[model samples]
Target: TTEIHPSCVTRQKVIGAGEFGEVYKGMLKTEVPVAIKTLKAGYTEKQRVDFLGEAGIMGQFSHHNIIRLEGVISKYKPMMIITEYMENGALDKFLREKDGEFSVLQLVGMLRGIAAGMKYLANMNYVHRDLAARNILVNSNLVCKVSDFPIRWTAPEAISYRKFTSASDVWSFGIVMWEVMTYGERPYWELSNHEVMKAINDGFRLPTPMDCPSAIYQLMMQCWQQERARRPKFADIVSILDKLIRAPDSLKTLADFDPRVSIRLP
Candidate 1:
């Protein structure tokens, strides 16, 4: 709101979608390259105001692993919400293009980076209701930064109870761990949205991807626990991943669970 100017930014190509808008790759003549999110036509005034308020909080966030909200433009049509440009784009696309390119250790490192960012968010008492691999952007040097993915990447309670919390964020992160283990595989890919909710209620959890390390799968299970209080915090997750990074041998020796090895797992 303070630094945004409509004429300064030039949107180029469509890049992705956001909870309320079309996202684009663009340039700022005065600042660095940016990603701009434009809302759907005829959005209500309250929706615009709410988004601006959220951006206000995000713009003040200062962390390497969190995407920086650059500014907002709302005085005219085709308005935008701007953020820093990530060279490699979303984590999902980045992983897809580099299939078999990175070791699981490297992938875990990326997960660690994401957890660190999540820890920062939790410290700030923010719930990333839409945490997923796609929302996380990768820049040069393969550093991953957390961004809001979608409104519905939320936990089931949010649907029924209209509540969001760091605990629910843990559930979303477990799904993201599933993404990392499988090189960006989709969670609940075989089920419809309604069915997914039922399946979770029936104690259905995602199977480990082919050759997924036992240690990471256990952490994912802890995250998906039925009791929200039982789930590990982002701070704990950061430490767990840090241990794995320091002792890489546990990548194989850690016997958390015996995962099924199917190349068709994803």
Candidate 2:
């Protein structure tokens, strides 16, 4: 594997920051631009383990829709994971800025990219519990790559004590689809995470976004179903998305679909 020269490992300006640490945009000694995610100071052992695990798993993935983990630095205090830089940044912010500027076909293409990434993760037996719009990063061509995995979203089964599964990631994917359709309105923004959890446990389902296709809406709702076993697999989602892409007219537009119709929670 090609390694970044030690001299080229200079700290770059921060692009974003979160609970885990700060992300920076910089070039390795090889002149390859990369995004570096560094851990915060005083992290617990569990935090280190989780971050390392995520980096290791992500490093194994080389799909077009999945962010590439080029290298890592664990010899020092604040560990860092190096990945390819995305010029357009996070998906939610990018979509919000575009705001109806993109054609429907463009949006469908973006969704396809995300689904492709999710399919890769699923194939690896990894579940991105938090598959929301914010976790996706887009490039100049509008191609989206999945990124970010807060501790809570990394290991669905272990984090939730087996209450979650790859199916749960599919549920989150439904919300991500809503974000795509609605142009990045925070999914369940009207309710708190606790409230959303309660509602979910109480048999409540997310409302279909405005102007979404009925076929897409049905597929997303199937993902959000509370019963994990009832949720559609990633393979099913990819197939549905492919069919929709091939015959978009067969899918009902948002205006043709009704949100008032209540869907079963499970």
Candidate 3:
């Protein structure tokens, strides 16, 4: 473990809650705002092991676009993990609130942050099973950091009887792109999870937002392809996004791009 600076210990107030526990908004004595997520009570032994496993892996990741795990608290019944606070909050809510206020370049910048995080995770051989917009946090600059680890979602194929791998994260990334383009419309709002799965298996896909760049739109579709092996790796996706970011002016307007090629199922 890294040395804990004495300046990192000022406690704050509760901000939110998730399945495992509540999150608090706090600050280090150094004045860095932090979010502390504590585990909930009644966790079975298996759950405890899973929690620790996630914390272990997350603690090892250190990157700008990846949320930093400042430390942990295990003195009480429910364990807690501290991380840097994201002022702008979740990407989904942030985008919806902005409602078209951001330009294409800004959106691309946000995606670049996401890709940078994913690239780091890939390097670590860790797959973030839940990579949706809601699981990404944005800072005041609109730089995104991937968050929320759904361990259950990453259960092995034999245990879950479903395929889950790094490629699945890529699929989720496509959904994140849809969320960004739609200004944060909930994924599959018109359909239930089961229905969405059925539609996906039956060759139905999400509609492309008006005017998304053709090349970028194509990349999203490739990410969601049924054949997971066909999906682009995080490194490849980073390269593509980098090119798009570098030539923002050359990219087509969301309104000018054709949807037919963008929204094809399978």
- Tens digit of per-residue lDDT, candidate 1, span 1-266: 45677889899999877657788988987658998988777777887777777778788789999998888886766667899898998898888778878888888999999999999998999888888888899998889999874332557676668678988988888888888877877687768777877887788887767767788989988998877888999989999999998999889754344444535654
Q: In order, how many clashes per candidate?
A: 0, 2, 5
Q: Residue pairs in steric clash, candidate 1? A: none
Candidate 3: lDDT over CA atoms? 0.75
How many clashes does the backbone of model 3 have? 5
- Candidate 2, TM-score vs. the true structure? 0.82
Reference-based TM-score of each model: 0.85, 0.82, 0.84
Top candidate when judged by TM-score against the true structure = 1
Q: lDDT by residue for model 3 over 160-192, one digit each (tens)?
A: 355667777877787787788778987667576
Per-residue CA lDDT of candidate 2, range 21-127, in tens?
98888887657788887888988888899888877888788899999877887766577888888898888888889888876667777888898889988888876
Q: Residue 233, candidate 2: how far off, in angstroms?
A: 0.3
Give the range of the ten consecutive residues with the poorest summed lDDT in model 2: 150-159
Clash-forming residue pairs, model 3: 210-254, 211-253, 211-254, 211-255, 212-254
Q: In angstroms, how far off is 12's CA in candidate 2?
A: 2.4
> lDDT per model, in order?
0.83, 0.75, 0.75
**Winning candidate number (lDDT):** 1
Better of 1 and 2 by lDDT: 1
